[PDB]
Write a protein that binds this DNA or RNA. Structure first.
Lengths: 52, 191, 105, 122, 58
RNA sequence: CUCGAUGUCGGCUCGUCGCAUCCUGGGGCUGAAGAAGGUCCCAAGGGUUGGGCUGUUCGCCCAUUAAAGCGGCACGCGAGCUGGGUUCAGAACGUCGUGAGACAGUUCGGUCUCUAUCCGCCACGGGCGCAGGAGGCUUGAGGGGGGCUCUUCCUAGUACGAGAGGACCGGAAGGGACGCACCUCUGGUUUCCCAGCUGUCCCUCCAGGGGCAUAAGCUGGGUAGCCAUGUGCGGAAGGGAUAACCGCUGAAAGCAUCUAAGCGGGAAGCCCGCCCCAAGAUGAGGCCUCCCACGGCGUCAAGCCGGUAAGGACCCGGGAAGACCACCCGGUGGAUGGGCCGGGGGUGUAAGCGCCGCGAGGCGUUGAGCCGACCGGUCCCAAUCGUCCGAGGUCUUGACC
């Protein structure tokens, strides 16, 4: 994928994946993805695998 | 020397099939010093110097098979401990020190409305009026960090030599890496 | 905190000036490494390096003085550009085993 | 995780909305309701009287907790939310339908029923 | 606010006994490097300057 | 006994006994088949939950549970809180009183004090001891820790059973509270490690910084150690002596009787076992590995001196070792600190120049820069040189060379 989108990344040959309601999702990564993303609009996201 | 033992490698888990965390342990054959027997009279420890080079800077199976390696010349490679086994190790607590009856000993402290009142940590009480002065009961700020700790059901998973070393099933060696580890599988229950 | 630094600061400062002062055991034991460390930077020697060293010390004269001045007299070794020497006496009332330290020379 | 009066929504339709957590179901002591687990709480509020109704004595289980669940697969999983499903004594749901995904779990501790109803089980 | 205070004349005896475990122990000092004399085991001095390097006065 | 004064309800915490035992095992009983109850004898090990409303305990109610025990110790605990409350003056009502005041009727609010001496407890050092002087290793008498449990499965839906049900016996698995230990994975830390920021003073103008804005001014994040929300693990076998309780062999009662004598059965319980000390248990224990008879003095001079680095120490340098202390490793024939150096980890691509847009900025160089303890090299630095103390081998008896 791309930490869902968070093109950064973090935590070994395992990692981990957060998640939201509605069969929707959020595979995941670092404390730079999280919080931010968990609170607005992905599009606008830069740094990473979006505003790449 | 009746047993087998060495020091703490460290911990990490990784792989398996579901996955599982253990700990590494260092120790080839720390030579063989006499051997336990109280024969004809009182016998226990001799010393026919054959040690290191520095050591004078300070100068019936378990023990038995020993005879095997302790007469070989001294040393004795560790590892019967094989594939899936339960020895037991006795680490050395951890210079944690003299602390409050808090962690030292489970206990609830200064509640709320007074769980702060620049108030806090400190036991509740000792003994009643009539009973009699005190008990040797209630612990105290009974220092820690130095205890001759250990445990049980110590299962070893695997081992390999490159450097005689052992992989463990759940670490909790007690003491810290580079620490003094001694193992055994005492009165095992999982047997 | 802000104090640990400050120290290292003025001490690092004053020192380089003389290259061996008089503070107690520890005090010195540290002003070393640090100050020390700093040195190793005068050694690096450049835009950056300087922009740091100064960053703390704050002061052309020196800052430069060392980077150029001393730095060299050291360009060769491997840290240690300081020889922390304990002292014989002790500040009064106190009784603190002060001590002296210099740029190994 | 999830006891006293921590609240959690529905994903099924039982006719609920959210529910307060009385007891962690199992036996004495015990202090925790983690998906798969089964809770002894009630309605904090439920639709316009579907079939349940606000403040209704209840029985529900674990399927969504941001407490993070360590998968024997040294893996890790969690959710943006915390809620579960009602049940018929017979570890049997009511909501005819599901909502947000969930986790293998359930299966492991019995419930298929939802296991599949679920839009997606992670 | 004297919750707790002694309760029985401390007993000279004891008292002192207390004050007993106390005691000094002369500076372990040694003898000069070449300074010739007695110095604070490990240091130059108003007799030295040396050690190996003349880092002092007199 | 106390008024030259023992601070009183409930709560909190920390608990400790006891058994008439609530849960828990073992039993005999039943109008007990099963299952589940009832009855009573034996056993306290361990254990006996969240809320509610009430100053309360008590108590009723809510959801659990095996269980949700009775009571001691001034209905334990104020020199340990609580301090609501009954129990200072206010002041209120109601209430009696000509009144004044008043009330186990009520209602608002109403100053719980830093320095433990002794005994006592928990802890760590100092003696002196254990009769050569010496470092290393072990025994444990005797103490202390810990023991609970639900549920799920086969045996089996077989015994029983008209049926709806549901076994001893025998065996898997999970989980609950709990405790020991531990960072790997997880999460909380991260007082400066790294990054973005607005206000301001110095900085030289710009840039590039600097304190302060707590003791970091603010926000994002962040090893290493500590630490849970998290990791291992544990409460078992089994051995012996019993409760109650069940039997055998058989008197006295030529017939019966677990019975005095003889022999066995039988418990979460005692003893043992499993961890945790531990001979200062003055009965100072064992054992191995070192060190040899030095001086001169009136004596059973077991008294004064060089010693033996056997050996230790002190001083230095260091430790998840740590209040001090004691305890551990090192002391330049060293890797012990720091330093440097590679390595990892960590912040998100720097200072500069460059190239696009009037500017704001961007894009590049550039996953840059900078890096606090984590893994390991290298004598740059700094543990130089030096002291002190330390044995000799007490008396009797005998056993062997």
């Amino acid at each position: 994928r791309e930490c869902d989108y968070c093109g950064t990344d973090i935590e070994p040959g395992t990692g981990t994946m957060f998640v939201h309601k509605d069969g929707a999702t959020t595979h995941f990564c670092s404390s730079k993805c999280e919080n931010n993303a968990d609170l607005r609009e992905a599009r606008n996201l830069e740094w990473t695998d979006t505003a790449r | 020397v009746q047993g087998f033992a060495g020091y703490k490698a460290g911990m990490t888990p990784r792989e398996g099939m579901e996955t599982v965390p253990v700990t590494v342990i260092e120790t080839p054959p720390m030579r063989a010093v006499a051997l336990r027997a109280y024969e004809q009279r009182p016998l226990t420890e001799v010393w026919t110097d054959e040690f290191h080079s520095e050591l004078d800077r300070t100068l019936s199976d378990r023990l038995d098979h020993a005879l095997d390696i302790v007469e070989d010349g001294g040393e004795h490679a560790m590892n019967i401990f094989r594939a899936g086994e339960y020895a037991d190790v006795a680490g050395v607590t951890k210079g944690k020190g003299t602390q409050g009856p808090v962690k030292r000993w489970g206990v609830q402290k200064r509640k709320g409305k007074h769980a702060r009142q620049g108030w806090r940590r400190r036991i509740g009480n000792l003994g009643p009026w009539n009973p009699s002065r005190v008990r040797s009961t209630v612990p105290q700020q009974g220092q820690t960090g130095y205890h001759q700790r250990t445990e049980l059901n110590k299962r070893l998973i695997d081992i390999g030599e490159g450097g005689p070393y052992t992989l463990v099933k759940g670490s909790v060696p007690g003491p810290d890496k580079r620490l003094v580890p001694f193992f055994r599988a005492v009165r095992p229950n999982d047997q | 905190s802000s104090h640990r630094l400050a120290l290292y600061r003025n001490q690092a400062k004053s020192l380089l000036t003389h290259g061996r002062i008089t503070t107690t055991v520890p005090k010195a034991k540290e002003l070393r490494g640090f100050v020390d460390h700093l040195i190793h930077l005068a050694k690096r020697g450049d835009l950056h390096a300087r922009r740091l060293v100064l960053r703390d010390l704050q002061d052309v004269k020196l800052v430069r003085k060392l980077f150029d001045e001393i730095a060299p007299r050291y360009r060769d070794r491997q840290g240690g550009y300081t020889r922390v020497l304990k002292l014989a006496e002790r500040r009064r009332g106190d009784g603190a085993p002060l001590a002296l330290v210099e740029l190994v020379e | 995780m999830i006891q006293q009066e921590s609240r959690l929504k529905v994903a099924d339709n039982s006719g609920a909305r959210e529910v307060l957590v009385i007891k962690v179901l199992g036996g004495s002591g015990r202090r925790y309701a983690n998906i798969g687990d089964v809770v002894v709480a009630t309605v904090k509020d439920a639709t316009p009287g579907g079939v349940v109704k606000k403040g209704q004595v209840v029985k529900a289980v674990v399927v969504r907790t941001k407490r993070g669940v360590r998968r024997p697969d040294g893996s890790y999983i969690r959710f943006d939310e915390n809620a579960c499903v009602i049940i018929r004594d017979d570890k049997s749901p009511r909501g005819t339908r599901i909502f947000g995904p969930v986790a293998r779990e359930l299966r492991d501790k019995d419930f298929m029923k939802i296991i599949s109803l679920a839009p997606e089980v992670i | 606010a004297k919750h707790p205070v002694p309760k029985k004349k401390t007993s000279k005896s004891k008292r002192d006994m207390r004050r007993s475990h106390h005691a000094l122990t002369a500076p372990n000092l040694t003898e000069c490097p070449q300074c010739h004399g007695k110095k604070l085991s490990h240091h130059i001095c108003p007799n030295c300057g040396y050690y190996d390097g003349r880092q002092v006065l007199a």
